[PDB]
Amino acid sequence: GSHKFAEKVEEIVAKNARAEIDYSDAPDEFRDPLMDTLMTDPVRLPSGTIMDRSIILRHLLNSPTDPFNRQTLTESMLEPVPELKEQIQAWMREKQNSDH
């Protein structure tokens, strides 16, 4: 949710930002092609789609085939995209102004 704002110790009351943080979705980029949710680890898959190496972890448990073009999906055979992370932390940072 959200600890607190200013050093002023208090409690999660005076609502001012729902229960999520601004950067909860982000443009049609940092968003998961499927989960549309902010990825925590953007990796490129052979099929040609970038998603969260996480949502992929389970994917291989109940379906080793891409969730999209139903294409055989094989972990380890993917390329990591770090040039993305930074970007995410950036554009989302300018909307944090709260380094707890």
Cβ 73 vs Cβ 45: under 8 Å: yes
Give the strands of the sheet with 42-45, arranged side by side.
49-52, 42-45, 79-80
Determine the residue type at 56.
Answer: I
Every domain of the chain and the residues it spans: 25-96
Nearest to 64, CA basis, from 79, 46, 41, 81: 46
3-state SS, one letter per residue, for the chain: CCCCCCCCCCCCCCCCCCCCCCCCCCCCCCECCCCCCECCCEEEECCCEEEEHHHHHHHCCCCCECCCCCCECCCCCCEECHHHHHHHHHHHHCCCCCCC
Cβ 49 vs Cβ 33: under 8 Å: yes
What CATH topology corresponds to 25-96?
Answer: Herpes Virus-1 (3.30.40)
Tokens of 87: 């970007």
